[PDB]
Amino acid sequence: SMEELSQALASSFSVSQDLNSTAAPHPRLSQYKSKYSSLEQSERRRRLLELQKSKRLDYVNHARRLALPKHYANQLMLSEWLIDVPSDLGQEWIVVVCPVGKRALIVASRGSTSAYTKSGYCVNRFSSLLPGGNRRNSTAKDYTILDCIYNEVNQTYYVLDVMCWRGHPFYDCQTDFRFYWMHSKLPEEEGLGEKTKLNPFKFVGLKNFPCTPESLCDVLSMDFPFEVDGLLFYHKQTHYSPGSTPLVGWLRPYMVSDVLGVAVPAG
Amino acid sequence: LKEHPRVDTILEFSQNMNTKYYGLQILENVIKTRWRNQCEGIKKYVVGLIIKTSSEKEKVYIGKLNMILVQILKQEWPKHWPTFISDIVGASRTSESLCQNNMVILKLLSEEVFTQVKSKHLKDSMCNEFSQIFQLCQFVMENSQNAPLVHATLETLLRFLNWIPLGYIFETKLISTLIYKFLNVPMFRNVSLKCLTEIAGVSVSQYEEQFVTLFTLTMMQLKQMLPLNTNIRLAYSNGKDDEQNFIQNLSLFLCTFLKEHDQLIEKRLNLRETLMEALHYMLLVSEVEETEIFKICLEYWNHLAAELYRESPFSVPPRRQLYLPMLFKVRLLMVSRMAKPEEDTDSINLYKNMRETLVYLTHLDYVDTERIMTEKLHNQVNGTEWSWKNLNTLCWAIGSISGAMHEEDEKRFLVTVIKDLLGLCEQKRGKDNKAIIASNIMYIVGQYPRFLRAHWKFLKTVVNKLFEFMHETHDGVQDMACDTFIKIAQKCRRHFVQVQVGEVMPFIDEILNNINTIICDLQPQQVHTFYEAVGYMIGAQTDQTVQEHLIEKYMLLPNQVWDSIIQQATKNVDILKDPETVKQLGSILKTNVRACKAVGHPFVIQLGRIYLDMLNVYKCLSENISAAIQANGEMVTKQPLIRSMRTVKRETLKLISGWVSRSNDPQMVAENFVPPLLDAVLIDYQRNVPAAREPEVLSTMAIIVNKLGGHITAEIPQIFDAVFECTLNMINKDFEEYPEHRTNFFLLLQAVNSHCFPAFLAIPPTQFKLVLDSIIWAFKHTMRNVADTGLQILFTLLQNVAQEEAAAQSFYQTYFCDILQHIFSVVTDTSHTAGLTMHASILAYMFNLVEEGKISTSLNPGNPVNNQIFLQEYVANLLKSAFPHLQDAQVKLFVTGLFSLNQDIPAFKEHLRDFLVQIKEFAGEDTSDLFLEEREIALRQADEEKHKRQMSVPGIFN
């Protein structure tokens, strides 16, 4: 009864009923099974990739609006916990090593660069060398929209995705593409990765890596200019769509060994 | 312009036009300012005008004239206008037209007859005067058929009922006349009822049968106008002011009557039906929407509940048995109309009262109350009463009874409450709906720590859910999650902290290990609450070394950024001019302030880690701030980067303050934190311009003084050097400029005075002079707060200076006289009489000194004389100069009375106020100002008897 009460409150008490939410611990570590846990992910992934194929929501206008969800809240594509490991993981997915920090929607718009939490609470309004985030770089629809993990200790917005660049929207492009575009547009800019009065915050993009066993092994042994928070696994083909999706998977580094059944070096 | 030079209006108003409102304003002036043969001519003339006038457009000048007649009466009547009352009857008792206005005038006069023994005496002495007023009324009620007159009469009766002798009310036919001839009738029915309720309020031992009759006859008439099957709730909202006020009056009647006289009706077994009928009404009115109406109903229910609780107080006693037929309906009303809990002074009260009533009722029958609640819950699941408003109210009421049941009953109850709401959440469709529910669940849970402390797995389940919700982006669920988390942490500390429960580690360990995972989606304000919450937990760790380790792990994240900033500063000082770095230091400090607040003394391991760096950053930003101002001036304070640095300084001071006041090792504070602080802040404060001076420098001095006393007396010279003069200038040219800096200055002064007195001798005389000027300014200021503080310091300085004979005499000789001059100057003047009671104690003390021969040498050094004579004269002298009107015979006698009342304070107070009583009656409007002091000390006895009666009631305070 008191056991029945706890179980009920742990496993059946949710405001937004997100499947495998990372607001609760990995299902593989919970003593209670939520009704919001699902050991299944592939079917839902296949189903979503099908849906993406026939794009029936105009995004070009969403990108400018910000310069399908309302104001500045829940605009970021958020991962489920990685549970049901894709049988074609190594061929069809890539891993981004994430920094300890805070997620941020970043909107560079007419002479300024403002950061938002998933909640839409604006955290800062500042200046940036991003196509729309400077008084000198403030123009007719040259707005850009990023998805960043902000690391306060290195005072840098680590770039995780790009949804819009110099007025070009990418919501409807695959991840391989988007990540390719960010790694190509970023270094094209006067010392972003540096500190200037005009650019208070450094914007470094995050490397992604293949997910073959040997590749993951390498990844885990690399050294990063930050403290490693976790591993995001993106399906190469997923478009950018705000919300929880099983097309991206999250694990903390100590989990990779167990859930992916792969080797690991010292750590 | 013109109204400057009596004689004019007597002539002016005779052939005047519309400009007559000036002539009336001129006459009112003369009368209210100076007040035989002259004004005796004025009285006669004034009365003549109205007698003429009122025997319709004229209406506005009538009231204007009536006004002044009352203005004079306030000064003349009755000691030097004894006929007035015998006269005014005569006039009216013959002319109806005249009778109208006299009623209007007597109503106006009673509004200057609005202190308990003072009024008791008036009711005794002026007994004759009232007797006649009542009889005038009687006669008018008895015979007139001039409606507008009869109304005005009734207005006057009401207005006088508390002053007319008892027998006229109860041994007459008043009660019956009022009920039959008047209550009965639409345009008279409101006033009628007010009168009857006024009567019902009378609290005596006799007239028992007359009260009982007053009950049954009024009920009888009421049941005829608003019959007991009316929908009062709807009648009120629709119907006109007329019918609204009648409903208000009805409840006012039943409530007044029953509160004072219920017991009478309870005993009279033939009166149940009618007793029940009164409750019926109270329930019907309790349905009314409006708050002001509910407040009276609620006062009634609280009375009923408290009586029965005091009879009972278990879960059948005789008075309870009477009310069982309708008690559950009161339970129902509280539950279904529970006010928003304290989570303005009126609304807090409103909730407190409703809680109180419900907690009483819950003790009477907990099973009934639980059942009402379970069922109100069912109806949220039903959808039959589903609404955000309704669910919230229910949950507030559930929360409100939180100590009233026994553990075991509580447990059973909460288990169904939580399950059912959990169910309700899974069942409702919105993200909106679910958020409303989830907050309510968390609200309830937070009101019942007793339940949480009893069951670890559940507590832990709840805290984990709260961490889960700290990621919810829906409207306010992150806020309710933090707010709940801090309540639970505060009320369950020990359960987290390095005491394992049915398992392997303390839970605090798991929290400290996943802090960034938990808080990474919160915003600053929420992170701070999270930190504060975790502080309480750590505060509960009794083992010091285990607790050091907790604080370190706890404080690790902000320390990372901190360390990174400091390193950058070390390599390049200019980093501290960087807008973002400065914004970061601000928040790292604010997190420190918040954790320190929660942890208290042991936070030292942290504060000590960062102290010298922090203080160094303080100096650097200080050098920045001032050099910025030294190249652009004052306006730089306006700039955002300056505000930003100033926040660092401020949070630095607040953090230090916060720790010191919570500190528990004055040697440590003294020999280790005090010096570096003092170096970093004092000279800085001095050399800065008035605009660039942090007020918290003052409050931080004040705190470390209050905390260390003797341990820092030695440093006070250094502190006053840098801080004392310049701060005074800043506030001395009053023009209220730095409210924070004065509230602080004086808090520091009062501290040095209380705990560091010896320091005043170690400061040069020129600076002690200043201390006195500054204390003098304080008790000389307008706003009571500042005055009251200044007095307090002075009074303590006096008692304190006495302790050092050598320098006692220097002081007395130098300042003694000058201080009375100034104090009397505050008592004598156009009086801000805020601290009359203080004045009393001060003067009393100072008189004693001379009387008791403690001022060893003479104050007049050229004409040596017993100081008690010198003072007796010097005061009389100073008084006869502030009051040149006063007769030199009264002065001598009063100054004699004072010194013969010195070694006694209460009587010395009454003696002095009485001087001002009789001497402000040669003025006017004063009375209630000097009386204001006594008044408050009756509210705090009403609070103390209330608040301490609540201690016996389980759940009324919890």
PDB file of N, CA, C and O in Angstrom, chain A residues 1-6 9-10 12-17 23-24 32 35-36 74 102 118-119 121 124 152-153 155 201, chain B residues 411 415 419 422 426 431 434 438 442 451 455 457-458 461 465 468-469 472-473 478 520-521 523 525 561 564 580-581 583-584:
ATOM      1  N   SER A   1       0.831  -1.253   0.000  1.00  0.00           N
ATOM      2  CA  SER A   1       0.000   0.000   0.000  1.00  0.00           C
ATOM      3  C   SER A   1       0.840   1.266   0.000  1.00  0.00           C
ATOM      4  O   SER A   1       0.645   2.139  -0.832  1.00  0.00           O
ATOM      5  N   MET A   2       1.757   1.364   0.950  1.00  0.00           N
ATOM      6  CA  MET A   2       2.795   2.365   0.933  1.00  0.00           C
ATOM      7  C   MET A   2       3.819   2.011  -0.158  1.00  0.00           C
ATOM      8  O   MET A   2       4.446   2.899  -0.748  1.00  0.00           O
ATOM      9  N   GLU A   3       4.006   0.723  -0.446  1.00  0.00           N
ATOM     10  CA  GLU A   3       4.868   0.344  -1.582  1.00  0.00           C
ATOM     11  C   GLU A   3       4.113   0.617  -2.870  1.00  0.00           C
ATOM     12  O   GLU A   3       4.673   1.109  -3.862  1.00  0.00           O
ATOM     13  N   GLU A   4       2.824   0.317  -2.836  1.00  0.00           N
ATOM     14  CA  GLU A   4       1.964   0.566  -3.966  1.00  0.00           C
ATOM     15  C   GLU A   4       1.881   2.053  -4.300  1.00  0.00           C
ATOM     16  O   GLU A   4       1.786   2.412  -5.463  1.00  0.00           O
ATOM     17  N   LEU A   5       1.940   2.905  -3.276  1.00  0.00           N
ATOM     18  CA  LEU A   5       1.859   4.351  -3.446  1.00  0.00           C
ATOM     19  C   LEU A   5       3.124   4.930  -4.090  1.00  0.00           C
ATOM     20  O   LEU A   5       3.044   5.699  -5.050  1.00  0.00           O
ATOM     21  N   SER A   6       4.285   4.559  -3.562  1.00  0.00           N
ATOM     22  CA  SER A   6       5.540   4.958  -4.155  1.00  0.00           C
ATOM     23  C   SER A   6       5.654   4.538  -5.604  1.00  0.00           C
ATOM     24  O   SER A   6       5.997   5.347  -6.457  1.00  0.00           O
ATOM     25  N   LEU A   9       3.622   6.627  -7.794  1.00  0.00           N
ATOM     26  CA  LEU A   9       4.055   7.984  -7.956  1.00  0.00           C
ATOM     27  C   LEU A   9       5.324   8.032  -8.778  1.00  0.00           C
ATOM     28  O   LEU A   9       5.561   9.006  -9.492  1.00  0.00           O
ATOM     29  N   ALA A  10       6.178   7.020  -8.646  1.00  0.00           N
ATOM     30  CA  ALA A  10       7.418   6.994  -9.411  1.00  0.00           C
ATOM     31  C   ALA A  10       7.063   6.744 -10.860  1.00  0.00           C
ATOM     32  O   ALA A  10       7.442   7.498 -11.733  1.00  0.00           O
ATOM     33  N   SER A  12       4.027   6.397 -12.597  1.00  0.00           N
ATOM     34  CA  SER A  12       2.841   6.885 -13.346  1.00  0.00           C
ATOM     35  C   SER A  12       2.405   8.303 -13.084  1.00  0.00           C
ATOM     36  O   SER A  12       1.222   8.564 -12.823  1.00  0.00           O
ATOM     37  N   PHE A  13       3.351   9.224 -13.183  1.00  0.00           N
ATOM     38  CA  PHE A  13       3.107  10.572 -12.770  1.00  0.00           C
ATOM     39  C   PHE A  13       3.957  11.465 -13.654  1.00  0.00           C
ATOM     40  O   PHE A  13       5.144  11.722 -13.361  1.00  0.00           O
ATOM     41  N   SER A  14       3.347  11.945 -14.738  1.00  0.00           N
ATOM     42  CA  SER A  14       4.080  12.704 -15.730  1.00  0.00           C
ATOM     43  C   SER A  14       3.253  13.846 -16.370  1.00  0.00           C
ATOM     44  O   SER A  14       2.085  13.690 -16.661  1.00  0.00           O
ATOM     45  N   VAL A  15       3.853  15.004 -16.573  1.00  0.00           N
ATOM     46  CA  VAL A  15       3.128  16.099 -17.175  1.00  0.00           C
ATOM     47  C   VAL A  15       3.184  15.998 -18.689  1.00  0.00           C
ATOM     48  O   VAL A  15       2.169  16.118 -19.349  1.00  0.00           O
ATOM     49  N   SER A  16       4.341  15.765 -19.272  1.00  0.00           N
ATOM     50  CA  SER A  16       4.347  15.496 -20.705  1.00  0.00           C
ATOM     51  C   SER A  16       4.828  14.096 -20.871  1.00  0.00           C
ATOM     52  O   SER A  16       5.961  13.801 -20.518  1.00  0.00           O
ATOM     53  N   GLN A  17       3.992  13.223 -21.384  1.00  0.00           N
ATOM     54  CA  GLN A  17       4.296  11.816 -21.289  1.00  0.00           C
ATOM     55  C   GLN A  17       5.310  11.394 -22.356  1.00  0.00           C
ATOM     56  O   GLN A  17       4.967  10.692 -23.299  1.00  0.00           O
ATOM     57  N   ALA A  23      14.559  12.830 -18.387  1.00  0.00           N
ATOM     58  CA  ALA A  23      14.362  13.608 -17.178  1.00  0.00           C
ATOM     59  C   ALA A  23      14.334  12.630 -16.004  1.00  0.00           C
ATOM     60  O   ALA A  23      14.518  12.993 -14.837  1.00  0.00           O
ATOM     61  N   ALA A  24      14.086  11.366 -16.336  1.00  0.00           N
ATOM     62  CA  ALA A  24      14.098  10.288 -15.364  1.00  0.00           C
ATOM     63  C   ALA A  24      15.313   9.490 -15.735  1.00  0.00           C
ATOM     64  O   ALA A  24      15.871   9.700 -16.814  1.00  0.00           O
ATOM     65  N   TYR A  32      11.727   0.975 -10.669  1.00  0.00           N
ATOM     66  CA  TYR A  32      10.371   0.906 -11.188  1.00  0.00           C
ATOM     67  C   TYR A  32      10.364   1.040 -12.715  1.00  0.00           C
ATOM     68  O   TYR A  32      11.122   1.851 -13.262  1.00  0.00           O
ATOM     69  N   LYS A  35       5.289   3.525 -17.181  1.00  0.00           N
ATOM     70  CA  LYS A  35       4.521   3.281 -18.360  1.00  0.00           C
ATOM     71  C   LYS A  35       5.053   4.167 -19.455  1.00  0.00           C
ATOM     72  O   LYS A  35       4.690   4.013 -20.605  1.00  0.00           O
ATOM     73  N   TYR A  36       5.940   5.091 -19.097  1.00  0.00           N
ATOM     74  CA  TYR A  36       6.572   5.958 -20.090  1.00  0.00           C
ATOM     75  C   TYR A  36       7.940   5.449 -20.574  1.00  0.00           C
ATOM     76  O   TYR A  36       8.636   6.117 -21.338  1.00  0.00           O
ATOM     77  N   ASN A  74      10.509  24.821 -26.085  1.00  0.00           N
ATOM     78  CA  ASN A  74      10.695  23.562 -26.788  1.00  0.00           C
ATOM     79  C   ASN A  74      10.817  23.667 -28.297  1.00  0.00           C
ATOM     80  O   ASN A  74       9.895  23.334 -29.040  1.00  0.00           O
ATOM     81  N   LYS A 102      24.703  23.781 -20.401  1.00  0.00           N
ATOM     82  CA  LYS A 102      23.277  23.961 -20.436  1.00  0.00           C
ATOM     83  C   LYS A 102      22.756  24.108 -21.868  1.00  0.00           C
ATOM     84  O   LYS A 102      23.310  24.902 -22.639  1.00  0.00           O
ATOM     85  N   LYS A 118      15.428  25.379 -22.877  1.00  0.00           N
ATOM     86  CA  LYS A 118      14.318  24.597 -23.431  1.00  0.00           C
ATOM     87  C   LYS A 118      12.981  25.170 -22.992  1.00  0.00           C
ATOM     88  O   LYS A 118      11.967  24.974 -23.647  1.00  0.00           O
ATOM     89  N   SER A 119      12.989  25.896 -21.885  1.00  0.00           N
ATOM     90  CA  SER A 119      11.765  26.458 -21.354  1.00  0.00           C
ATOM     91  C   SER A 119      11.387  27.761 -22.024  1.00  0.00           C
ATOM     92  O   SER A 119      10.259  28.205 -21.898  1.00  0.00           O
ATOM     93  N   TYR A 121      12.843  30.504 -21.472  1.00  0.00           N
ATOM     94  CA  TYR A 121      13.346  31.570 -20.623  1.00  0.00           C
ATOM     95  C   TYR A 121      14.660  32.030 -21.233  1.00  0.00           C
ATOM     96  O   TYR A 121      15.624  31.267 -21.325  1.00  0.00           O
ATOM     97  N   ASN A 124      20.275  35.147 -21.869  1.00  0.00           N
ATOM     98  CA  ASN A 124      21.129  36.278 -22.277  1.00  0.00           C
ATOM     99  C   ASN A 124      20.688  36.919 -23.600  1.00  0.00           C
ATOM    100  O   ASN A 124      19.974  36.302 -24.369  1.00  0.00           O
ATOM    101  N   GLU A 152      29.785  27.278 -19.313  1.00  0.00           N
ATOM    102  CA  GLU A 152      30.103  28.552 -18.649  1.00  0.00           C
ATOM    103  C   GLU A 152      31.584  28.740 -18.338  1.00  0.00           C
ATOM    104  O   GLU A 152      32.105  29.857 -18.389  1.00  0.00           O
ATOM    105  N   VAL A 153      32.248  27.632 -18.014  1.00  0.00           N
ATOM    106  CA  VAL A 153      33.641  27.629 -17.540  1.00  0.00           C
ATOM    107  C   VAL A 153      34.629  27.927 -18.678  1.00  0.00           C
ATOM    108  O   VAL A 153      35.654  28.554 -18.448  1.00  0.00           O
ATOM    109  N   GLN A 155      33.327  29.676 -21.099  1.00  0.00           N
ATOM    110  CA  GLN A 155      32.466  30.706 -21.709  1.00  0.00           C
ATOM    111  C   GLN A 155      32.290  30.496 -23.239  1.00  0.00           C
ATOM    112  O   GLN A 155      32.484  31.428 -24.040  1.00  0.00           O
ATOM    113  N   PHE A 201      31.181  35.608 -26.581  1.00  0.00           N
ATOM    114  CA  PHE A 201      31.156  34.189 -26.424  1.00  0.00           C
ATOM    115  C   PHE A 201      31.676  33.517 -27.660  1.00  0.00           C
ATOM    116  O   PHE A 201      31.239  33.832 -28.774  1.00  0.00           O
TER     117      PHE A 201
ATOM    118  N   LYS B 411      -1.993   9.114   7.890  1.00  0.00           N
ATOM    119  CA  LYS B 411      -1.446   8.189   6.945  1.00  0.00           C
ATOM    120  C   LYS B 411      -2.539   7.610   6.062  1.00  0.00           C
ATOM    121  O   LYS B 411      -2.477   7.715   4.852  1.00  0.00           O
ATOM    122  N   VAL B 415      -2.777   8.513   1.915  1.00  0.00           N
ATOM    123  CA  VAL B 415      -2.675   7.414   0.981  1.00  0.00           C
ATOM    124  C   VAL B 415      -3.876   7.431   0.043  1.00  0.00           C
ATOM    125  O   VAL B 415      -3.683   7.306  -1.169  1.00  0.00           O
ATOM    126  N   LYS B 419      -3.014   8.640  -4.026  1.00  0.00           N
ATOM    127  CA  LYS B 419      -3.486   7.683  -5.057  1.00  0.00           C
ATOM    128  C   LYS B 419      -4.534   8.269  -5.989  1.00  0.00           C
ATOM    129  O   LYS B 419      -4.429   8.159  -7.203  1.00  0.00           O
ATOM    130  N   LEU B 422      -3.131  11.067  -8.109  1.00  0.00           N
ATOM    131  CA  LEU B 422      -2.288  10.389  -9.068  1.00  0.00           C
ATOM    132  C   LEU B 422      -3.127   9.816 -10.181  1.00  0.00           C
ATOM    133  O   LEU B 422      -2.817  10.007 -11.346  1.00  0.00           O
ATOM    134  N   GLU B 426      -3.273  10.878 -14.365  1.00  0.00           N
ATOM    135  CA  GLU B 426      -3.209   9.949 -15.474  1.00  0.00           C
ATOM    136  C   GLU B 426      -4.466  10.043 -16.335  1.00  0.00           C
ATOM    137  O   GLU B 426      -4.464   9.593 -17.461  1.00  0.00           O
ATOM    138  N   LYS B 431      -1.707  18.908 -21.137  1.00  0.00           N
ATOM    139  CA  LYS B 431      -0.466  19.159 -20.408  1.00  0.00           C
ATOM    140  C   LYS B 431      -0.820  20.206 -19.360  1.00  0.00           C
ATOM    141  O   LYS B 431      -0.344  20.149 -18.246  1.00  0.00           O
ATOM    142  N   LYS B 434      -2.723  18.292 -16.427  1.00  0.00           N
ATOM    143  CA  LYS B 434      -1.695  17.590 -15.688  1.00  0.00           C
ATOM    144  C   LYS B 434      -0.763  18.492 -14.853  1.00  0.00           C
ATOM    145  O   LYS B 434      -0.380  18.122 -13.750  1.00  0.00           O
ATOM    146  N   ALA B 438      -0.458  18.044 -10.867  1.00  0.00           N
ATOM    147  CA  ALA B 438       0.850  17.736 -10.322  1.00  0.00           C
ATOM    148  C   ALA B 438       1.285  18.757  -9.269  1.00  0.00           C
ATOM    149  O   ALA B 438       1.908  18.408  -8.274  1.00  0.00           O
ATOM    150  N   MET B 442       1.991  17.947  -5.287  1.00  0.00           N
ATOM    151  CA  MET B 442       3.207  18.395  -4.628  1.00  0.00           C
ATOM    152  C   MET B 442       2.879  19.364  -3.513  1.00  0.00           C
ATOM    153  O   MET B 442       3.495  19.318  -2.450  1.00  0.00           O
ATOM    154  N   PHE B 451       4.290  12.880   7.450  1.00  0.00           N
ATOM    155  CA  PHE B 451       4.095  11.700   6.604  1.00  0.00           C
ATOM    156  C   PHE B 451       5.389  11.273   5.905  1.00  0.00           C
ATOM    157  O   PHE B 451       5.751  10.089   5.918  1.00  0.00           O
ATOM    158  N   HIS B 455       8.059   7.771   6.175  1.00  0.00           N
ATOM    159  CA  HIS B 455       8.238   6.757   5.129  1.00  0.00           C
ATOM    160  C   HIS B 455       9.313   7.068   4.109  1.00  0.00           C
ATOM    161  O   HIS B 455       9.038   7.688   3.089  1.00  0.00           O
ATOM    162  N   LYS B 457      11.173   5.415   1.599  1.00  0.00           N
ATOM    163  CA  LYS B 457      10.977   5.109   0.194  1.00  0.00           C
ATOM    164  C   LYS B 457      10.071   6.126  -0.499  1.00  0.00           C
ATOM    165  O   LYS B 457      10.369   6.567  -1.631  1.00  0.00           O
ATOM    166  N   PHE B 458       8.991   6.520   0.170  1.00  0.00           N
ATOM    167  CA  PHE B 458       8.099   7.513  -0.404  1.00  0.00           C
ATOM    168  C   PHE B 458       8.742   8.910  -0.518  1.00  0.00           C
ATOM    169  O   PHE B 458       8.654   9.553  -1.576  1.00  0.00           O
ATOM    170  N   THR B 461      11.007   8.739  -3.307  1.00  0.00           N
ATOM    171  CA  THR B 461      10.246   8.700  -4.535  1.00  0.00           C
ATOM    172  C   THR B 461       9.794  10.087  -4.896  1.00  0.00           C
ATOM    173  O   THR B 461       9.868  10.476  -6.049  1.00  0.00           O
ATOM    174  N   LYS B 465      10.968  12.521  -8.154  1.00  0.00           N
ATOM    175  CA  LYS B 465       9.956  13.058  -9.077  1.00  0.00           C
ATOM    176  C   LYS B 465      10.185  14.561  -9.236  1.00  0.00           C
ATOM    177  O   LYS B 465      10.023  15.122 -10.330  1.00  0.00           O
ATOM    178  N   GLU B 468      12.860  15.098 -11.572  1.00  0.00           N
ATOM    179  CA  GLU B 468      12.357  14.856 -12.906  1.00  0.00           C
ATOM    180  C   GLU B 468      11.618  16.097 -13.427  1.00  0.00           C
ATOM    181  O   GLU B 468      11.736  16.431 -14.612  1.00  0.00           O
ATOM    182  N   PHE B 469      10.880  16.775 -12.544  1.00  0.00           N
ATOM    183  CA  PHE B 469      10.033  17.877 -12.950  1.00  0.00           C
ATOM    184  C   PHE B 469      10.857  19.109 -13.122  1.00  0.00           C
ATOM    185  O   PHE B 469      10.395  20.084 -13.701  1.00  0.00           O
ATOM    186  N   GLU B 472      10.775  19.755 -16.604  1.00  0.00           N
ATOM    187  CA  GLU B 472       9.539  20.073 -17.318  1.00  0.00           C
ATOM    188  C   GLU B 472       9.477  21.494 -17.820  1.00  0.00           C
ATOM    189  O   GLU B 472       9.584  22.447 -17.049  1.00  0.00           O
ATOM    190  N   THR B 473       9.256  21.648 -19.112  1.00  0.00           N
ATOM    191  CA  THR B 473       9.141  22.977 -19.666  1.00  0.00           C
ATOM    192  C   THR B 473       7.771  23.597 -19.546  1.00  0.00           C
ATOM    193  O   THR B 473       7.605  24.731 -19.928  1.00  0.00           O
ATOM    194  N   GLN B 478       8.502  23.798 -13.130  1.00  0.00           N
ATOM    195  CA  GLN B 478       9.852  23.916 -12.576  1.00  0.00           C
ATOM    196  C   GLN B 478       9.848  24.726 -11.305  1.00  0.00           C
ATOM    197  O   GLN B 478      10.550  24.387 -10.353  1.00  0.00           O
ATOM    198  N   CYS B 520      20.591  21.422 -14.647  1.00  0.00           N
ATOM    199  CA  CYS B 520      21.026  21.976 -15.934  1.00  0.00           C
ATOM    200  C   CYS B 520      19.960  22.662 -16.802  1.00  0.00           C
ATOM    201  O   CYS B 520      20.327  23.434 -17.674  1.00  0.00           O
ATOM    202  N   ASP B 521      18.670  22.423 -16.567  1.00  0.00           N
ATOM    203  CA  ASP B 521      17.627  23.173 -17.285  1.00  0.00           C
ATOM    204  C   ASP B 521      16.928  24.271 -16.495  1.00  0.00           C
ATOM    205  O   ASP B 521      15.989  24.890 -17.001  1.00  0.00           O
ATOM    206  N   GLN B 523      16.700  27.952 -14.343  1.00  0.00           N
ATOM    207  CA  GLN B 523      17.262  29.263 -14.522  1.00  0.00           C
ATOM    208  C   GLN B 523      17.833  29.752 -13.185  1.00  0.00           C
ATOM    209  O   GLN B 523      17.573  29.167 -12.124  1.00  0.00           O
ATOM    210  N   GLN B 525      17.300  31.910 -10.699  1.00  0.00           N
ATOM    211  CA  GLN B 525      16.452  31.992  -9.511  1.00  0.00           C
ATOM    212  C   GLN B 525      16.168  30.571  -8.977  1.00  0.00           C
ATOM    213  O   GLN B 525      16.215  30.340  -7.756  1.00  0.00           O
ATOM    214  N   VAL B 561      34.152  27.743 -11.848  1.00  0.00           N
ATOM    215  CA  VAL B 561      34.102  28.939 -12.642  1.00  0.00           C
ATOM    216  C   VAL B 561      34.905  29.994 -11.927  1.00  0.00           C
ATOM    217  O   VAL B 561      35.759  30.640 -12.537  1.00  0.00           O
ATOM    218  N   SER B 564      38.565  29.557 -12.361  1.00  0.00           N
ATOM    219  CA  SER B 564      38.899  29.864 -13.718  1.00  0.00           C
ATOM    220  C   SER B 564      38.967  31.382 -13.876  1.00  0.00           C
ATOM    221  O   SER B 564      39.897  31.884 -14.500  1.00  0.00           O
ATOM    222  N   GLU B 580      31.082  40.173 -19.255  1.00  0.00           N
ATOM    223  CA  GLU B 580      30.543  38.843 -18.901  1.00  0.00           C
ATOM    224  C   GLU B 580      31.168  38.206 -17.671  1.00  0.00           C
ATOM    225  O   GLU B 580      30.473  37.532 -16.894  1.00  0.00           O
ATOM    226  N   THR B 581      32.482  38.393 -17.517  1.00  0.00           N
ATOM    227  CA  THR B 581      33.205  37.892 -16.354  1.00  0.00           C
ATOM    228  C   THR B 581      32.599  38.495 -15.079  1.00  0.00           C
ATOM    229  O   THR B 581      32.358  37.794 -14.088  1.00  0.00           O
ATOM    230  N   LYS B 583      29.601  39.659 -14.736  1.00  0.00           N
ATOM    231  CA  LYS B 583      28.258  39.156 -14.553  1.00  0.00           C
ATOM    232  C   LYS B 583      28.356  37.793 -13.915  1.00  0.00           C
ATOM    233  O   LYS B 583      27.524  37.458 -13.074  1.00  0.00           O
ATOM    234  N   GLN B 584      29.389  37.029 -14.269  1.00  0.00           N
ATOM    235  CA  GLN B 584      29.587  35.694 -13.690  1.00  0.00           C
ATOM    236  C   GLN B 584      29.944  35.712 -12.212  1.00  0.00           C
ATOM    237  O   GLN B 584      29.377  34.939 -11.432  1.00  0.00           O
TER     238      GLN B 584
END
